Every structure is written in structure tokens, then in C-alpha cells.
């Protein structure tokens, strides 16, 4: 939600199958296209929910 | 002993094996979170 | 995470016991005369 309140979705970060998720990209991004190469680093890309966009666009 | 005439062979074909393993594994994937709680 | 300490063996036997049942039955079907 773009308010610097990160939601944990992955198994290794404390989730089980029922609670786990790939979390949607940041509200600060909005509808902006956020590929890996728009981030300064993978660490930034991950914080802002880059995986969600890559996955849903390739999936669709 | 004289043989029992009521015996019958039992079968599980390969598709049934695959279906059954899928059922078990998916049920495990589903209930395991609740077993760990 | 503070999970149930029996969750691992519960899940393991939940998978193994019925899976093994099916594998026993499948393999002895294949070994029957064709």
C-alpha cells in the first residue's frame, strides 16, 4: 500500500501455504510499468513488489 | 488347507495410482498448514 | 515460527501411509500375468 508497511508473503519469511502470497506491487507505483530494469537494484525491486507485475503480465 | 473359493485378485491401474497420489499430495498440501498451526 | 511439534510427523505419515498403500497395490497389479 505504498506506506512503508511491508507485508510478508513468502514461506521463508514466516508464511504457510494458506497465508503465503506474492504480494501486489506498491501503491506508490500505481499503474506505472515497473520491470526489473526500472529499479536501482533487485533489493529495491523486491521491496516494491516487482515480482507481482512480472508474474501477472507474463501469466496473462 | 483346501483353498477358499471366495478369494479374488485386486487391481490398481496406473491412472488410478496417479489420481490417488494427486489426491493424497494435494490433501497434504492443504492440511499441512493446519497440522503445523 | 512456533509451530506444532507433531505437525511434521502428522504431515509425513498423512502422505506416506496412503501413498504406500497405493504403490503396493499398483506394483502387484503390474506383476500379474499379462
Amino acid at each position: 500500500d505504498g506506506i512503508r508497511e511491508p507485508v510478508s508473503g513468502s514461506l521463508l519469511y514466516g508464511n504457510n501455504i494458506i497465508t503465503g502470497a506474492v504480494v501486489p506491487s506498491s501503491n506508490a507505483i500505481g499503474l506505472h510499468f515497473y520491470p526489473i530494469w526500472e529499479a536501482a537494484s533487485l533489493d529495491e525491486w523486491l521491496y516494491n513488489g516487482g515480482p507481482y507485475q512480472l508474474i501477472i503480465f507474463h501469466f496473462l | 488347507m483346501e483353498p477358499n473359493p471366495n478369494r479374488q485378485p485386486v487391481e490398481l491401474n496406473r491412472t488410478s495410482l496417479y489420481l490417488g497420489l494427486l489426491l493424497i499430495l494435494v490433501l497434504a498440501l492443504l492440511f499441512s498448514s493446519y497440522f503445523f498451526n | 515460527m512456533e509451530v506444532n511439534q507433531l505437525g511434521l510427523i502428522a504431515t509425513a505419515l498423512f502422505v506416506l501411509v496412503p501413498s504406500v498403500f497405493l504403490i503396493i497395490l499398483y506394483v502387484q497389479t503390474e506383476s500379474q500375468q499379462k
Binding site: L11, L12, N16, I17 | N13, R14, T15, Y18, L21, L22, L25, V26, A28, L29, S32, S33, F36 | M1, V3, G7, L8, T11, A12, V15
Partner: peptide, 30 residues
């Protein structure tokens, strides 16, 4: 331990998909 368990079950399912497709009983017309 929980993560290993979840990923293990998932990996078995993916393996099962592979055998169920490529090592299925072949359909045969009789």
C-alpha cells in the same frame, strides 16, 4: 522445517505431473 515440508510436497506434485503426462498409460483403440 515447515518450509521444507511445503516445498517437498509441491515438488512431489510437479514430479507427479511429469510422470502422469509422459509416463501415462497410452490410450489404445481396440
Amino acid at each position: 522445517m515447515e518450509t521444507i515440508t511445503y516445498v517437498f510436497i509441491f515438488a512431489c506434485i510437479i514430479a507427479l505431473f511429469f510422470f502422469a503426462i509422459f509416463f501415462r498409460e497410452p490410450p489404445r483403440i481396440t
